[PDB]
Write a protein that binds this ligand. Structure first.
Ligand SMILES: OC[C@H]1O[C@H](O[C@H]2O[C@H](CO)[C@@H](O)[C@H](O)[C@H]2O)[C@H](O)[C@@H](O)[C@@H]1O
Length: 402
């Protein structure tokens, strides 16, 4: 009978690809359907290019794709409309914000799978060691704590120790980190939901300058090459006081044999001052049936299974990834394993989105502009003032007649 083929997640990022393949095989065994898993590169923007090869070809060789929250507006022509396959009651079990994000010109492109928000990981043993009782609330405090703990850990002999790691590589992850920096300085959303390109302002410029000031000082010089896993591996070996990353890193850090197990917490990222808004960039993935799938019925069944309560629960318990069903955030087993899901739920709900709705099918070009201009500041090629002006001009060209 049919072979249902799935491309989504990567075995290069934590346990996501291995776990996704396991869930697909479980569905296959449950329903007596043959399945195949096709691996993907680590970085979301590389995945988009890979999947676009299949879509350009109208290829029937993948039935189900795991698609980034930033993609519906780009990928909608390649998605089977799921709306007729779900009842209104079924759809209401997901956060309405994500269902709305996934709906493009009335087409439900994809089912919400897991959400995501940028958070601050911090070594609580080290905060205590150095006389701090709370994680930092402001970027200035983060800097002061990092300098002090670094001075001490280096003096004690850990020459590998850094104050802060984050995603500074030129790719989509840096758009995520940079939106957090800019927004948390009161510098706006880069492109506002109304279309206004707002990034050329002194608060956004300050945010980028500040981040440059970390590189080679509290963060490794090589941070300008780090994606999620490069940052996580410095952190997880016990060599960083702080890390900006997504929820998945938590379960990995708690695993048996992790050097940092039991030694860290998570909190909202810092901000410039008490009246700036908190910033956590909205992430996460959705489940799309290919418009080119020869087996829509079976592929829809698989996507419903993957998005189900018990598969999302398993994702939360084992991989510390955030459900897209509000009912899971009150589940006793989810909460006992991840108590921070409760503490940060409002951070997750107030996550700031990248400008994917407003940029639509042009979002990838906009983000490339953002990450290359931000990167030119991290590398020291440009100051923030010049980079936000140059970025404004680039985005104006991209979106001109959008
Ligand atoms: O659970 C974390 C996931 O990390 C990646 O996805 C996040 O980071 C991307 C940027 O690098 C965002 O565009 C995305 O929205 C985030 O969810 C990774 O691509 C995933 O497969 C991981 O599960």
């Amino acid at each position: 009978g049919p072979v249902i083929r799935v491309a989504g997640d990567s075995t290069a990022v934590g346990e996501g690809g291995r776990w996704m393949k396991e869930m697909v095989e479980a569905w296959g065994k449950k329903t007596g359907t043959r399945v195949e898993y096709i691996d993907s590169p680590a970085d979301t923007n590389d995945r988009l290019a890979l999947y676009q090869q299949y879509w350009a070809a109208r290829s029937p060789d993948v039935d189900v794709y795991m698609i980034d929250v930033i993609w519906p507006g780009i990928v909608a022509p390649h998605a089977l409309d799921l709306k007729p396959y779900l009842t209104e009651a079924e759809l209401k079990e997901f956060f309405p914000r994500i269902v709305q994000n996934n709906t493009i010109r009335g087409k439900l492109t994809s089912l919400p799978f897991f959400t995501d928000a940028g958070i601050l990981y911090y070594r609580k043993d080290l905060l205590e060691k150095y006389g701090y009782t709370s994680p930092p609330r402001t970027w200035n405090e983060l800097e002061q704590m990092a300098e002090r703990v670094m001075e001490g850990e280096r003096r004690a002999g850990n020459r590998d120790f850094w104050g802060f790691v984050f995603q500074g590589k030129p790719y989509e992850g840096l758009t995520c980190d940079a939106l957090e920096w800019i927004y948390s300085h009161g510098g706006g959303r880069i492109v506002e939901p109304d279309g206004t390109i707002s990034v050329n302002n002194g608060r956004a410029a300050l945010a980028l300058n500040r981040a440059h000031g970390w590189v080679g000082r509290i963060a490794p010089q090589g941070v300008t090459s780090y994606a999620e896993e490069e940052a996580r591996n410095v952190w997880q070996q016990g060599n960083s006081l702080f890390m900006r990353n997504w929820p998945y890193a938590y379960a990995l850090g708690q695993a048996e044999g992790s050097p940092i197990r039991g030694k860290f917490g998570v909190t909202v990222l810092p901000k410039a001052s008490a009246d700036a808004p908190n910033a956590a960039t909205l992430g996460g993935f959705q489940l799309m049936v290919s418009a080119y799938s020869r087996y829509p019925k079976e592929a829809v069944d698989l996507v419903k299974y993957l998005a189900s309560y018990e598969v999302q629960k398993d994702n939360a318990v084992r991989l510390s990834r955030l459900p897209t069903r509000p009912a899971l955030y009150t589940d006793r087993d989810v909460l006992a394993r991840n108590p921070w899901f409760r503490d940060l739920l409002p951070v997750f709900q107030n996550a700031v989105s990248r400008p994917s709705d407003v940029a639509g099918a042009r979002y990838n070009q906009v983000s490339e502009a953002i990450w290359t201009e931000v990167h030119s500041v991290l590398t020291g090629r440009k100051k923030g003032e010049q980079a936000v002006r140059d970025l404004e001009a680039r985005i104006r060209r991209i979106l001109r007649h959008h």
